[PDB]
Scaffold this active site. Structure first.
Site, PDB file in Angstrom:
ATOM      1  N   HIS A  48     -44.953  14.480 -33.746  1.00  0.00           N
ATOM      2  CA  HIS A  48     -45.965  14.845 -34.416  1.00  0.00           C
ATOM      3  C   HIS A  48     -45.849  15.131 -35.878  1.00  0.00           C
ATOM      4  CE1 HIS A  48     -47.912  15.192 -30.213  1.00  0.00           C
ATOM      5  NE2 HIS A  48     -46.651  16.106 -29.971  1.00  0.00           N
ATOM      6  N   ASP A  54     -51.986  15.551 -41.019  1.00  0.00           N
ATOM      7  CA  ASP A  54     -52.553  14.813 -41.988  1.00  0.00           C
ATOM      8  C   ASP A  54     -53.748  15.878 -42.395  1.00  0.00           C
ATOM      9  OD1 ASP A  54     -54.516  13.474 -43.759  1.00  0.00           O
ATOM     10  OD2 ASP A  54     -54.140  11.600 -42.344  1.00  0.00           O
ATOM     11  N   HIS A 113     -56.881  16.344 -44.488  1.00  0.00           N
ATOM     12  CA  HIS A 113     -57.736  15.640 -45.551  1.00  0.00           C
ATOM     13  C   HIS A 113     -57.915  16.506 -46.746  1.00  0.00           C
ATOM     14  CE1 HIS A 113     -59.734  12.728 -42.365  1.00  0.00           C
ATOM     15  NE2 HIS A 113     -58.546  12.794 -42.467  1.00  0.00           N
ATOM     16  N   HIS A 136     -55.531  16.166 -38.827  1.00  0.00           N
ATOM     17  CA  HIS A 136     -55.191  15.783 -37.621  1.00  0.00           C
ATOM     18  C   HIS A 136     -53.858  15.231 -37.760  1.00  0.00           C
ATOM     19  CE1 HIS A 136     -55.471  11.446 -38.840  1.00  0.00           C
ATOM     20  NE2 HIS A 136     -56.665  11.934 -39.608  1.00  0.00           N
ATOM     21  N   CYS A 137     -53.323  14.906 -36.355  1.00  0.00           N
ATOM     22  CA  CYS A 137     -51.961  14.453 -36.119  1.00  0.00           C
ATOM     23  C   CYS A 137     -52.040  12.990 -36.624  1.00  0.00           C
ATOM     24  CB  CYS A 137     -51.534  14.481 -34.879  1.00  0.00           C
ATOM     25  SG  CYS A 137     -49.762  14.232 -34.631  1.00  0.00           S
ATOM     26  N   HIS A 181     -53.218   9.958 -30.870  1.00  0.00           N
ATOM     27  CA  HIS A 181     -52.837  11.327 -30.804  1.00  0.00           C
ATOM     28  C   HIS A 181     -54.201  11.876 -31.120  1.00  0.00           C
ATOM     29  CE1 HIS A 181     -48.311  11.788 -30.773  1.00  0.00           C
ATOM     30  NE2 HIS A 181     -48.617  10.602 -30.414  1.00  0.00           N
ATOM     31  N   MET A 188     -55.747  15.835 -31.254  1.00  0.00           N
ATOM     32  CA  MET A 188     -55.053  16.436 -32.243  1.00  0.00           C
ATOM     33  C   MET A 188     -55.827  16.478 -33.552  1.00  0.00           C
ATOM     34  SD  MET A 188     -51.008  15.469 -31.286  1.00  0.00           S
ATOM     35  CE  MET A 188     -50.219  16.908 -32.367  1.00  0.00           C
ATOM     36  N   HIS A 224     -77.626  18.693 -33.992  1.00  0.00           N
ATOM     37  CA  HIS A 224     -79.169  19.137 -33.827  1.00  0.00           C
ATOM     38  C   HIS A 224     -78.907  20.358 -33.059  1.00  0.00           C
ATOM     39  CE1 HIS A 224     -83.282  19.044 -33.316  1.00  0.00           C
ATOM     40  NE2 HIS A 224     -83.093  19.018 -32.113  1.00  0.00           N
ATOM     41  N   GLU A 284     -83.345  18.405 -39.264  1.00  0.00           N
ATOM     42  CA  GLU A 284     -83.727  18.464 -37.930  1.00  0.00           C
ATOM     43  C   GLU A 284     -82.516  17.924 -37.364  1.00  0.00           C
ATOM     44  OE1 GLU A 284     -86.568  15.616 -36.597  1.00  0.00           O
ATOM     45  OE2 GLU A 284     -86.291  14.416 -38.349  1.00  0.00           O
ATOM     46  N   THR A 285     -81.905  17.027 -37.640  1.00  0.00           N
ATOM     47  CA  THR A 285     -80.789  16.331 -37.145  1.00  0.00           C
ATOM     48  C   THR A 285     -79.969  15.980 -38.338  1.00  0.00           C
ATOM     49  OG1 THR A 285     -81.565  15.560 -35.084  1.00  0.00           O
ATOM     50  CG2 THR A 285     -79.741  14.426 -36.088  1.00  0.00           C
ATOM     51  N   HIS A 319     -77.264  14.433 -31.079  1.00  0.00           N
ATOM     52  CA  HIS A 319     -78.918  14.086 -30.809  1.00  0.00           C
ATOM     53  C   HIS A 319     -78.878  12.533 -30.533  1.00  0.00           C
ATOM     54  CE1 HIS A 319     -83.060  14.142 -30.075  1.00  0.00           C
ATOM     55  NE2 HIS A 319     -82.980  15.102 -30.406  1.00  0.00           N
TER      56      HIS A 319
HETATM   57 CU   LIG Z   1     -49.271  13.950 -32.498  1.00  0.00          CU
HETATM   58 CU   LIG Z   2     -57.552  11.142 -41.544  1.00  0.00          CU
END
Ligand SMILES: [Cu+2]
Ligand SMILES: [Cu+2]
Ligand SMILES: [Cu+2]
Ligand SMILES: [Cu+2]
Ligand SMILES: [Cu+2]
Lengths: 334, 124, 334
Positions: C88, C91, C93, C128-129, C138, C143, C248, C272-273, C299
């Site tokens: 594993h 990452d 963001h 996330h992985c 993954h 993940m 929503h 609303e959404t 929604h």
């Molecule tokens: Cu992973």
């Molecule tokens: Cu990414």
């Protein structure tokens, strides 16, 4: 006279670590300067994600340990941010007069005060918030810690002989009284004040929901275990500002222990379990002789394993078959 | 008329986090003015029982704030950081039309103990 | 320089809670230390006993929400226990450089690694992985979570005016691609590795078998409904790390919403959404004006009711006829 003496200032460190300091010291009396800032905050006190509407000195349960020598003077500057909602103050069990400081440290949110007192007596001493009419709440919510006042030439055995620790770990045990809803779940409060009325009622039962070292179940286990090495000598400083406990090192002893926590008196030796009186702090020495994981706990095992009053010391080095060896390992019976 | 409730930490007689006075009988068109006599407290409606179709009050923190006695009935007002410590006040605008809501309203602990005291002060 | 700055440890909690944290803080940059522990496991993802060979951060889909403030540094120790079968990484963001951290956090089972980055930008960001050549597997197997980096003095409206939540829930939405046998009924795998190929075969149809909040159909209903009360302002944080969703709240709105998830950008109001791009996290504030059971959902009503992307919010307080009223209850037609 105190206005004349050298004013050093120390930087504090989060438990279990204790700030660095001379045991024995040829140094003379000085005024030592500290600073602590009160933080009210919700804290997570177990693996299930139960919270506590906590109050703390300087972000932590317990508050950091303050370390000075006999005849020094303590100069504490106590700050209570307007980010807070309550008055606080401080009772130093090591002080003399003014309810141990409390009268001259009543700070509202946005206030701060500075207080000096004299460490005429050696030992480990409690300090805790004592705002009038709410002493027991603020204290059980996390506003306590330890003041160590070492003798001027180190720690001493009953035959007046000198004694030395390679590190000092500090442990604050916190008996907590967290409420429940009708559905048996621990409650979760959206502000501190909303915690009050329910919490005092749980208090009155004298039955803690949790009992924890340094803030949480598992505070001092796994990757936050304490560490030492064979041949190394540790000072284990236990505080409990509200309720009795009985510490014990599994596979160990207290080579020398001042359970009433006052160094002037001769320590006892070879203890299996010792006893910290609620509203006291105490200390114990152990020189490690075997590697492995040790469990440092309150030897009420219900309080320890069920309620949360246990930590670990990871210890490195050389197994030693004289003290202990396995003759025949678990094998079947003939 | 314009009536002054003080936001205060202690009362002369011990117990803490209080509006002074805790109860106030006023008229249609009057204004109550809650005031930072001590920093730390605020004044704001108690939504769970505050009456139908009325400008809620959520005055600022450590800051003064005013209530407009428009519709006539009873008006409960906490200090949010200390409502669990019973810092609470009751304002009567003429007739107590909505007493029955207020009596039922399930306050608890120091809030209940103090508020019920203010409730008895209601002029009928 | 960051090595100098204060360090602070933070205890994480299970979604949909979000560990205690200040919004506006009067506090300088610090290094905030976090641990997560990867857990592979077989998870029941619906009410007909269907399973996923899942992979999680801390044993939950989503992994728990990390909260810091703009200018702080993030210090994640990531642990891949030897009981796991796969390598594993992570990452972020929110991070700048080295594929979000992935390159410096590759850990095989029995390994662990510690990564620091500056959180120079504010918003809710996915982590996330992302193991080379295994990335989408993954991620869709569980993940991912959210890093929320608040601005140093809370969230703000477009005019500059401060906005405040009383609580925060975190919701991760998971498009799952669970294989089918030739009999029409879903597969059950003996190991995670065994599930791989069949699974990527489904992934490529771009058709989820399920779409769930927080790890299973109904995860956030009944006894696990989120809760609030008329008057409370909540923050809803919604991550989707692989696929678009359009959240929503039935009978509600997004009072202020950052659909692209980044707080230096003015929020939209009265939504609303709103829309969460695959590989993004967003945030919406709502103050409840009415008691009742609400639904919060994706929604695309098929994705919600057929596939599982729906939850409940249970709200207490007193009804308001100004906002809405039943003039003439259902009755026969003259
Ligand atoms: Cu992973
Ligand atoms: Cu990414
Ligand atoms: Cu206090
Ligand atoms: Cu005391
Ligand atoms: Cu107040």
């Amino acid at each position: 006279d105190a206005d004349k003496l050298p004013h050093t200032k120390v930087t504090l460190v989060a438990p279990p670590q204790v700030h660095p300091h001379e045991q024995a010291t040829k140094s003379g009396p000085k005024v030592v300067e500290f600073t602590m800032t009160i933080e009210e905050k919700k804290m997570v006190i177990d693996d299930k994600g139960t919270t506590l509407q906590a109050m703390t000195f300087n972000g932590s349960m317990p508050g950091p340990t303050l370390v000075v020598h006999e005849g020094d003077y303590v100069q504490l500057t106590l700050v209570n941010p307007a980010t807070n909602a309550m008055p606080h103050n401080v009772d130093f069990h090591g002080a003399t007069g003014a309810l141990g400081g409390a009268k001259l440290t009543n700070v509202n949110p946005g206030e701060q005060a500075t207080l000096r007192f004299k460490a005429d007596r050696s030992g480990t001493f409690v300090y805790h918030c004592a705002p009038e009419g709410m002493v027991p709440w603020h204290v059980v919510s996390g506003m306590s810690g330890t003041l160590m006042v070492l003798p001027r030439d180190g720690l001493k055995d009953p035959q007046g002989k000198p004694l030395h620790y390679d590190r000092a770990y500090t442990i604050g045990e916190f008996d907590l009284y967290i409420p429940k809803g009708p559905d048996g779940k621990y409650k979760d409060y959206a502000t501190l004040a909303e915690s009050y009325g329910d919490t005092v009622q749980v208090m009155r039962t004298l039955t803690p929901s949790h009992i924890v070292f340094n803030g949480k179940v598992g505070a001092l286990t796994g990757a936050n275990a304490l560490t030492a090495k064979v041949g190394e000598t540790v000072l284990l400083i236990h505080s409990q500002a509200n309720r009795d406990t009985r510490p014990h090192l599994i596979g160990g002893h207290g080579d020398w222990v001042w359970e009433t926590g006052k160094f002037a008196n001769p320590p006892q030796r070879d203890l299996e379990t010792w006893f910290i009186r609620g509203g006291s702090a105490g200390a114990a020495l152990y020189t490690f002789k075997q590697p492995g994981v040790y469990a440092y706990l309150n030897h009420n095992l219900i309080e320890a394993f069920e309620l949360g009053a246990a930590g670990h010391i990871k210890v490195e080095g050389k197994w030693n078959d004289d003290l202990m060896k396995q003759i025949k390992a678990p094998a079947p019976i003939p | 008329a314009e009536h002054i409730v003080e936001m205060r930490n202690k009362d002369d007689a011990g117990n803490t986090m209080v509006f002074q006075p805790g109860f106030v009988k006023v008229e249609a068109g009057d204004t109550v003015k809650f005031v930072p006599t001590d920093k730390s407290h605020n004044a704001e409606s108690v939504r769970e029982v505050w009456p139908e179709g009325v400008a809620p009050v959520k005055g600022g923190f450590s800051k003064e704030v005013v209530f407009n006695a428009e519709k006539e009935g009873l008006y409960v007002l906490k200090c949010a950081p200390h409502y669990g410590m019973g810092m609470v006040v009751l304002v009567q605008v003429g007739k107590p039309v909505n007493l029955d809501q207020i009596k039922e309203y399930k306050a608890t602990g120091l809030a209940k103990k103090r508020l019920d005291g203010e409730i008895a002060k209601v002029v009928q």
